Amino acid sequence: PQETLNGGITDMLTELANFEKNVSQAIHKYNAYRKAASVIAKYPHKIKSGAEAKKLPGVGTKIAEKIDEFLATGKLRKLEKIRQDDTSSSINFLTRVSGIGPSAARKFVDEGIKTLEDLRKNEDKLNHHQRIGLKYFGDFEKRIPREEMLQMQDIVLNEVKKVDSEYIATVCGSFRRGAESSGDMDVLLTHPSFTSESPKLLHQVVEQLQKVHFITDTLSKGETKFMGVCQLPSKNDEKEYPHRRIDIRLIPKDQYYCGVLYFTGSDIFNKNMKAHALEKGFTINEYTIRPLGVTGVAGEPLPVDSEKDIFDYIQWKYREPKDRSE
DNA sequence: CCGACGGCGCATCAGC
DNA sequence: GCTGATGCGC
DNA sequence: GTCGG
Ligand SMILES: Nc1ncnc2c1ncn2[C@H]1C[C@H](O)[C@@H](COP(=O)(O)CP(=O)(O)OP(=O)(O)O)O1
Numbered sequence A: 001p002q003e004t005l006n007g008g009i010t011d012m013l014t015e016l017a018n019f020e021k022n023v024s025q026a027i028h029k030y031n032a033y034r035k036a037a038s039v040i041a042k043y044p045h046k047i048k049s050g051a052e053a054k055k056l057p058g059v060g061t062k063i064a065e066k067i068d069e070f071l072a073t074g075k076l077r078k079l080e081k082i083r084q085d086d087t088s089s090s091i092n093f094l095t096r097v098s099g100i101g102p103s104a105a106r107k108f109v110d111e112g113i114k115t116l117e118d119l120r121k122n123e124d125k126l127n128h129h130q131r132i133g134l135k136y137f138g139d140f141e142k143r144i145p146r147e148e149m150l151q152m153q154d155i156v157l158n159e160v161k162k163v164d165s166e167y168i169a170t171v172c173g174s175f176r177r178g179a180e181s182s183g184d185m186d187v188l189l190t191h192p193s194f195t196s197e198s199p200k201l202l203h204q205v206v207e208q209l210q211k212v213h214f215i216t217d218t219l220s221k222g223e224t225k226f227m228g229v230c231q232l233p234s235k236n237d238e239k240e241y242p243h244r245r246i247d248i249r250l251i252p253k254d255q256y257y258c259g260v261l262y263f264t265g266s267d268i269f270n271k272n273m274k275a276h277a278l279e280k281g282f283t284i285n286e287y288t289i290r291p292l293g294v295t296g297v298a299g300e301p302l303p304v305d306s307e308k309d310i311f312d313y314i315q316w317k318y319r320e321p322k323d324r325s326e
Numbered sequence B: 001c002c003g004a005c006g007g008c009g010c011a012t013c014a015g016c
Numbered sequence C: 001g002c003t004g005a006t007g008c009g010c
Numbered sequence D: 001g002t003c004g005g
């Protein structure tokens, strides 16, 4: 539904979420406010009262009261107060830097470091990840048009196959679901030589992507997970492309399609679909699907060579990534 | 009333 | 030096 | 903050 509908309420609730996460360090309250914001965002009527909102799952007594105040006055006193608080507003702002969480943000502000400018002046106090987040502060907040995501996929699949034609690589996330923009790029990688039974398999791929100057920085890298930065090549005379976030995950072959399913999402759909599998005698996670015995004891992971196999264990019919919004 | 609300890879800290 | 905890992001 | 055992 249109934002004008309840956008004021949803904006209020998201701002509250952010203060709970970044300032109060209350992650579960952050998620409570986000859940309330989502269900309200999907509500196809302009909310007239807190009572009306309370009928939705995730909206309770306190949010109902906040909605009543917002509706009667057009603001929320406590949010107005938080906004003008130099300490709170600065802490909340610094967490937009990738690598600066609530703990780091609090410490910086405690010592007089409140702005990106102060961060620039204080490089020695920033760890590697934080320096990268600062460097690309603006770029990391931009979204990625699907047309660029396709150019990016083109490079990733080409270079992976060039390293070893037996690798399998799948760009997952919202992109695989057919979205017209993405926040970042998620790549799942596997290889026949890597099973749960059985490295350098990930390194070889990261190395090649750096060699062709697609990967530009590294946030973290181990034997199964890479998190870093990449950029599309620019044409002479054209404005250069923003730097983008990319993650690459190496997963065992025998867990690969459970991973593709899971990392394609949405979370709504995942959380959603864990359900059916249960009621049908199955426990599912990002790695495996296992049968639940008559007392609830999990059996060995079931064999899986496709996304559809998973649906076929729970007697469902394949639903394309296109239709997995929920 | 009162505990769950996701869990885990990687980087870095804290303590030994 | 090593092992476990914490912070962070997802 | 909300839900639910
Ligand atoms: N809070 C959560 N709980 C459970 N699962 C979650 C999750 N957040 C993300 N996931 C899962 C599903 C995503 O497809 C996948 C990657 O999460 P992602 O952060 O890359 C979001 P996509 O779903 O990629 O949107 P976007 O990138 O275009 O903005 O991991």
Ligand SMILES: [Mg+2]
Pocket (backbone or CB within 6 Å): A173, A174, A182, A183, A184, A185, A186
């Ligand atoms: Mg993504």
Ligand code: NA
Pocket (backbone or CB within 6 Å): A094, A095, A096, A097, A098, A099, A100, A101
């Ligand atoms: Na951050």
Ligand code: NA
Pocket (backbone or CB within 6 Å): A095, A096, A097
């Ligand atoms: Na952030």
